[PDB]
Scaffold this motif. Structure first.
Motif, PDB file in Angstrom:
ATOM      1  N   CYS A   1      -7.135  -8.305   1.861  1.00  0.00           N
ATOM      2  CA  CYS A   1      -6.131  -7.343   2.270  1.00  0.00           C
ATOM      3  C   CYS A   1      -5.734  -6.331   1.207  1.00  0.00           C
ATOM      4  O   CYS A   1      -5.274  -5.248   1.572  1.00  0.00           O
ATOM      5  CB  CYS A   1      -4.866  -8.065   2.752  1.00  0.00           C
TER       6      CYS A   1
ATOM      7  N   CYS B   1      -6.397  -2.340   0.960  1.00  0.00           N
ATOM      8  CA  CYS B   1      -5.492  -1.400   1.587  1.00  0.00           C
ATOM      9  C   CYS B   1      -4.035  -1.706   1.312  1.00  0.00           C
ATOM     10  O   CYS B   1      -3.221  -0.789   1.322  1.00  0.00           O
ATOM     11  CB  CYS B   1      -5.717  -1.357   3.106  1.00  0.00           C
ATOM     12  N   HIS B   2      -3.691  -2.960   1.031  1.00  0.00           N
ATOM     13  CA  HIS B   2      -2.303  -3.383   0.968  1.00  0.00           C
ATOM     14  C   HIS B   2      -1.839  -3.781  -0.428  1.00  0.00           C
ATOM     15  O   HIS B   2      -0.864  -4.527  -0.535  1.00  0.00           O
ATOM     16  CB  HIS B   2      -2.029  -4.530   1.936  1.00  0.00           C
TER      17      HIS B   2
ATOM     18  N   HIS C   1      -8.364  -2.607  12.673  1.00  0.00           N
ATOM     19  CA  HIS C   1      -7.649  -3.416  11.700  1.00  0.00           C
ATOM     20  C   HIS C   1      -8.288  -4.794  11.591  1.00  0.00           C
ATOM     21  O   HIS C   1      -8.690  -5.359  12.612  1.00  0.00           O
ATOM     22  CB  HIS C   1      -6.162  -3.571  12.065  1.00  0.00           C
TER      23      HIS C   1
HETATM   24  C1  HEC Z   1      -7.384  -1.073   5.378  1.00  0.00           C
HETATM   25  C2  HEC Z   1      -8.672  -0.861   5.649  1.00  0.00           C
HETATM   26  C3  HEC Z   1      -6.679  -2.412   5.718  1.00  0.00           C
HETATM   27  C4  HEC Z   1      -7.033  -3.690   5.470  1.00  0.00           C
HETATM   28  C5  HEC Z   1      -8.257  -4.236   4.695  1.00  0.00           C
HETATM   29  C6  HEC Z   1      -6.001  -4.545   6.025  1.00  0.00           C
HETATM   30  N1  HEC Z   1      -5.056  -3.749   6.612  1.00  0.00           N
HETATM   31 FE1  HEC Z   1      -3.196  -4.279   7.274  1.00  0.00          FE
HETATM   32  N2  HEC Z   1      -2.782  -2.447   7.904  1.00  0.00           N
HETATM   33  C7  HEC Z   1      -3.625  -1.379   7.715  1.00  0.00           C
HETATM   34  C8  HEC Z   1      -3.123  -0.270   8.495  1.00  0.00           C
HETATM   35  C9  HEC Z   1      -3.745   1.137   8.569  1.00  0.00           C
HETATM   36  C10 HEC Z   1      -2.022  -0.671   9.111  1.00  0.00           C
HETATM   37  C11 HEC Z   1      -1.146   0.161  10.061  1.00  0.00           C
HETATM   38  C12 HEC Z   1      -1.712  -0.023  11.466  1.00  0.00           C
HETATM   39  C13 HEC Z   1      -0.897   0.792  12.427  1.00  0.00           C
HETATM   40  O1  HEC Z   1       0.072   0.263  12.996  1.00  0.00           O
HETATM   41  O2  HEC Z   1      -1.221   1.986  12.612  1.00  0.00           O
HETATM   42  C14 HEC Z   1      -1.790  -2.047   8.763  1.00  0.00           C
HETATM   43  C15 HEC Z   1      -0.750  -2.820   9.199  1.00  0.00           C
HETATM   44  C16 HEC Z   1      -0.527  -4.119   8.840  1.00  0.00           C
HETATM   45  C17 HEC Z   1       0.651  -4.910   9.096  1.00  0.00           C
HETATM   46  C18 HEC Z   1       1.920  -4.457   9.840  1.00  0.00           C
HETATM   47  C19 HEC Z   1       2.921  -3.872   8.858  1.00  0.00           C
HETATM   48  C20 HEC Z   1       4.246  -3.613   9.520  1.00  0.00           C
HETATM   49  O3  HEC Z   1       5.030  -2.824   8.960  1.00  0.00           O
HETATM   50  O4  HEC Z   1       4.530  -4.199  10.592  1.00  0.00           O
HETATM   51  C21 HEC Z   1       0.448  -6.112   8.560  1.00  0.00           C
HETATM   52  C22 HEC Z   1       1.403  -7.308   8.574  1.00  0.00           C
HETATM   53  C23 HEC Z   1      -0.856  -6.121   7.959  1.00  0.00           C
HETATM   54  N3  HEC Z   1      -1.417  -4.892   8.149  1.00  0.00           N
HETATM   55  C24 HEC Z   1      -1.452  -7.161   7.309  1.00  0.00           C
HETATM   56  C25 HEC Z   1      -2.733  -7.200   6.824  1.00  0.00           C
HETATM   57  C26 HEC Z   1      -3.353  -8.366   6.262  1.00  0.00           C
HETATM   58  C27 HEC Z   1      -2.651  -9.721   6.134  1.00  0.00           C
HETATM   59  C28 HEC Z   1      -4.584  -8.049   5.876  1.00  0.00           C
HETATM   60  C29 HEC Z   1      -5.607  -9.007   5.234  1.00  0.00           C
HETATM   61  C30 HEC Z   1      -6.256  -9.838   6.057  1.00  0.00           C
HETATM   62  C31 HEC Z   1      -4.795  -6.655   6.204  1.00  0.00           C
HETATM   63  N4  HEC Z   1      -3.640  -6.177   6.774  1.00  0.00           N
HETATM   64  C32 HEC Z   1      -5.934  -5.913   5.991  1.00  0.00           C
HETATM   65  C33 HEC Z   1      -4.745  -1.354   6.927  1.00  0.00           C
HETATM   66  C34 HEC Z   1      -5.440  -2.446   6.464  1.00  0.00           C
END
Ligand code: HEC
Ligand code: CLA
Ligand SMILES: CCCCCCCCCCCCCCCCCC(=O)OC[C@H](CO[C@@H]1O[C@H](CO)[C@H](O)[C@H](O)[C@H]1O)OC(=O)CCCCCCCCCCCCCCCCC
Ligand SMILES: CC1=C(/C=C/C(C)=C/C=C/C(C)=C/C=C/C=C(C)/C=C/C=C(C)/C=C/C2=C(C)CCCC2(C)C)C(C)(C)CCC1
Ligand SMILES: CC1=C(/C=C/C(C)=C/C=C/C(C)=C/C=C/C=C(C)/C=C/C=C(C)/C=C/C2=C(C)CCCC2(C)C)C(C)(C)CCC1
Lengths: 56, 97, 244, 56, 56, 137
Positions: free
Chosen positions: F37, F40-41, F92
């Motif tokens: 994760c 991106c995160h 995602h």
């Molecule tokens: C980029 C290529 C990403 C990777 C790798 C992971 N995530 Fe991500 N996440 C990404 C985006 C562009 C978004 C927004 C999607 C949208 O609604 O348009 C998200 C969102 C989340 C969220 C929600 C956050 C919130 O404010 O509610 C969570 C909890 C989240 N993502 C978790 C997450 C995890 C645990 C990852 C690893 C397995 C992961 N993401 C990968 C982009 C990308």
């Protein structure tokens, strides 16, 4: 307070490379012999005469 | 005289509430259930002459109207500030993190 | 005979509007019962003219021709919108979306650069009444909005801007502010421009029209720091009428 | 010292206008960063009055 | 935040300002400490701090 | 300061039962978050969409709430937009799109809990740094 500019203009040199002319007309092209081109020619000539002075 | 219109608009309800005619789309994240779907419809159908005009957007589900009804106390409407809506700035105002 | 990107790339033809052959002197019937739209409005400027400001008030203040310095970045293309048929027989193009702006810089004699946002943003343009067919005498006259050349986040070299930036001249911490106010307060202009599209060639079959335009608008005012010049833009256009 | 004198006046029944009007201008002038000797410049030449102006 | 500025003592004693450009401008002066009125015209003062003779 | 049980005690559900993670669980979650994760995160932001971060208050206003373990686990199974209106698994990473996001293939429920615990514990550790971006570096 222009002193040499009228001497250039008297004999034909009227335009600038920046695009204007002394009669104020628009959009004419002076070629090499603009006011800047005269000034450049005199500078180059000045340097060549300096070198010839050294040799002589 | 000359005034910063963006600085002036912070003196209105724009500085306190989400302005449906001016505020960037990312500010709809601050409340549950508006972003992205309802936020997209609100910005697309701006301007509004009152907040309650947000319920008149064509195509809303009754759940979508209920969510908007729960959030009208966070909304306001002012005159469209051209410095805030031009350049696509309601969708991307150049701010990230 | 249709070209690809590798044929076009780096030739300058991507900044050109499509042309209609000399043979296409036809006419395009506007059925009043059917709706129409514009699949692509292209505008390729050829001549930018800037009006001088002689400090005299009177005198001959004519439009002087300028030299383009920002290269083949000038055309507006891929513009779409609804071509309505009105009650009185006239057609009104309402502009919806497209590449409808290009920043252009031209240079006058003396070296003064003139930046302008060459645009047709939100163009409403209408023909004459009783035009049942788009012919080679059709004229789309209309108006558009000219937003500020820079948008609100733009910062000047001293870090001053409208929606961002300093509100004062920080390098002069104890200077008087009222002489610096026109530079310190950034102002977003929104002005009107006028354009006349004159049709010269009509594809009666396909629905492709082409011709010349003339557009008049204000140049950049540097977010309110100086007066904008009056610009006249001339060039060619192309429009493809798809029935909707 | 400015704040001390203001609180001594305000403890004695002076108003806020009266407490601050009792501060000498000479004392308030020392409490201004344009009189700090560490705000200048190597080539910012001349008197301090050339900078911010003559204090009136 | 509805920020206002009131002046006590000195030239603006008793005066209160509420328009945000005017309130901001005195706030930009308050970073320097006490706010003074200057004559920038007699010396063509550039507004840029210089050091004192103690500094030089 | 230590990584005590109280730090490691996060909400499990929307009702209010808590789960106290182990230090092994938090450290495994940080490893798997970095693995899957953080591209991106990193730091709790979102590089490809900076409007939506991983702060606890932001996940609370998501629909359904993602500010507990099971909400984050369901998101890692079937991610949505912030209102829950669309299913975004095709863009995602999730268990249901492990064929296009191959780092999600061998994730267990124990792994998904551990990543979810790292997302919840980390702002209790870092404060405004988590989800703050470069301002708080
Ligand atoms: C980029 C290529 C990403 C990777 C790798 C992971 N995530 Fe991500 N996440 C990404 C985006 C562009 C978004 C927004 C999607 C949208 O609604 O348009 C998200 C969102 C989340 C969220 C929600 C956050 C919130 O404010 O509610 C969570 C909890 C989240 N993502 C978790 C997450 C995890 C645990 C990852 C690893 C397995 C992961 N993401 C990968 C982009 C990308
Ligand atoms: C101890 C020395 C000294 C000091 C501290 C002062 C201090 C002052 N002078 Mg005075 N003054 C002095 C001696 C001094 N003076 C001398 C000797 C003269 C006769 C020239 C003067 C004539 C004079 C006049 C006419 C004026 C002052 C003024 C002032 C005030 C402003 C100063 C200023 O702007 O300088 C600016 C300083 C610099 C810009 C620094 C100079 C840096 C040099 C050029 C760099 C040299 C580099 C070197 C060549 C490199 C070598 C390399 C090599 C070794 C390889 C200040 C109170 C002014 C004033 O306000 O009076 C009312 C004013 O008008 N002074
Ligand atoms: C014999 C011939 C000698 C020829 C003199 C040579 C002149 C050139 C000398 C260098 C010029 C100095 C630059 C100052 C420019 C100028 O405008 O100043 C002009 C300034 C005066 O400043 C003027 O003041 C006016 C009202 O008084 C107005 O305010 C003007 O705006 C302001 O310019 O004069 C001084 O600089 C003179 C005093 C110099 C103080 C010396 C400080 C000590 C520095 C020691 C550093 C030594 C480092 C050694 C390194 C090795
Ligand atoms: C300041 C001023 C001014 C200005 C001035 C000027 C600008 C001047 C200049 C001048 C000049 C500029 C001059 C010069 C001169 C020169 C000379 C005099 C030279 C000589 C030389 C020689 C001597 C040579 C030698 C040689 C050689 C080198 C080699 C070969 C051989 C021989 C040996 C020949 C004015 C008036 C405006 C005003 C007032 C102030
Ligand atoms: C034709 C013509 C013209 C004219 C021109 C002229 C006028 C020319 C001139 C020329 C010249 C005027 C030349 C010169 C040359 C020179 C030289 C060639 C020199 C050299 C030298 C040397 C080689 C030297 C060396 C040295 C030194 C430097 C130092 C010491 C040592 C020695 C000595 C070795 C014109 C433009 C009108 C127009 C067109 C045509």
């Amino acid at each position: 307070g222009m002193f040499v500019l009228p001497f250039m203009a008297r004999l034909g040199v009227t335009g600038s490379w920046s695009g204007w002319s002394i009669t104020g007309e628009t959009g004419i092209d002076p070629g090499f012999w603009s006011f800047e081109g005269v000034a450049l020619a005199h500078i180059v000539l000045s340097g060549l005469l300096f070198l010839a002075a050294c040799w002589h | 005289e000359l005034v910063n219109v963006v600085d002036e608009k912070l003196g209105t309800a724009y500085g306190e509430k989400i302005d449906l005619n001016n505020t960037n789309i990312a500010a709809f994240i601050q409340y549950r259930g508006l972003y992205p779907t309802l936020a997209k419809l609100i910005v697309k159908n701006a301007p509004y002459e009152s907040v309650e005009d947000v319920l008149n957007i064509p195509g809303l589900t009754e759940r979508q109207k209920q969510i908007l009804r729960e959030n009208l106390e966070h909304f306001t409407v002012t005159e469209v500030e051209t410095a805030l809506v031009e350049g696509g700035d309601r969708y991307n105002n150049g701010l990230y993190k | 005979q249709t070209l690809t990107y590798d044929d076009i790339v780096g030739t300058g033809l991507a900044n050109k509007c499509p042309t209609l052959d000399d043979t296409a002197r036809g006419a395009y019937p506007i059925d009043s019962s059917q709706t129409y739209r514009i699949a692509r409005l292209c505008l390729q400027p050829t001549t930018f003219l800037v009006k001088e400001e002689p400090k005299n008030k009177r005198q001959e203040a004519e439009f002087v021709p300028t030299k383009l310095v920002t290269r083949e970045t000038t055309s507006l293309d891929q513009i779409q919108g609804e071509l309505k048929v009105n009650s009185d027989g006239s057609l009104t193009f309402v502009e919806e979306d497209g590449i409808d702006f290009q920043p252009v810089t031209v240079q006058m004699a003396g070296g003064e650069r003139i930046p302008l946002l060459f645009t047709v943003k939100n163009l409403v343009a209408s023909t004459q009444p009783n035009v049942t067919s788009i012919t080679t005498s059709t004229d789309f006259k209309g108006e558009f909005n000219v937003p500020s050349y820079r948008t609100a986040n733009f910062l000047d070299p001293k870090g001053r801007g409208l929606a961002s930036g300093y509100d004062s001249a920080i390098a002069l911490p104890q200077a008087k502010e009222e002489e610096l106010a026109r530079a310190n307060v950034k102002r977003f202009s929104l002005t009107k421009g006028q354009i006349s599209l004159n049709v010269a060639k009509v594809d009666g079959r396909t629905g492709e029209i082409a011709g010349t335009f003339e557009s008049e608008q204000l140049s950049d005012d540097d977010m309110g720091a100086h007066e904008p010049h009056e610009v006249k833009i001339q060039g060619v256009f192309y429009a493809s009428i798809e029935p909707a | 010292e400015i704040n001390r004198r203001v609180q001594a006046s305000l403890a004695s029944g002076a108003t806020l206008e009266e407490a601050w009007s009792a501060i000498p201008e000479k004392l308030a002038f020392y409490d201004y960063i344009g009189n700090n000797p560490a705000k200048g410049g190597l080539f910012r030449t001349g008197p301090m009055n050339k900078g911010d102006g003559i204090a009136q | 935040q509805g920020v206002t500025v009131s002046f006590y003592g000195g030239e603006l004693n008793g005066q209160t300002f509420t328009d945000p450009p005017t309130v901001k401008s005195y706030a930009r002066k308050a970073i320097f400490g006490e706010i003074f009125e200057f004559d920038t015209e007699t010396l063509n003062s550039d507004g840029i701090f210089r050091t004192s003779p103690r500094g030089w | 300061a230590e990584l005590t049980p109280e730090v490691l005690t996060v909400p499990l559900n929307s009702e209010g039962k808590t789960i106290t993670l182990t230090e092994k669980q938090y450290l495994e979650g940080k490893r798997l978050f970095q693995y899957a994760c953080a591209s991106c995160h990193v730091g709790g932001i979102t590089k490809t969409n900076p409007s939506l971060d991983l702060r606890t208050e932001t996940l609370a206003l998501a629909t359904p709430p993602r500010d507990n373990i099971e909400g984050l686990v369901d998101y890692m199974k079937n991610p949505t937009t912030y209102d829950g209106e669309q299913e975004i698994a095709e863009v995602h990473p999730s268990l249901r799109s492990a064929d296009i996001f191959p780092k999600m293939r061998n994730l267990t429920e124990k792994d998904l809990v551990a990543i979810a615990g790292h997302i919840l514990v980390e702002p209790k550790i870092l404060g405004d740094k988590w989800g703050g971006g470069k301002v708080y570096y």
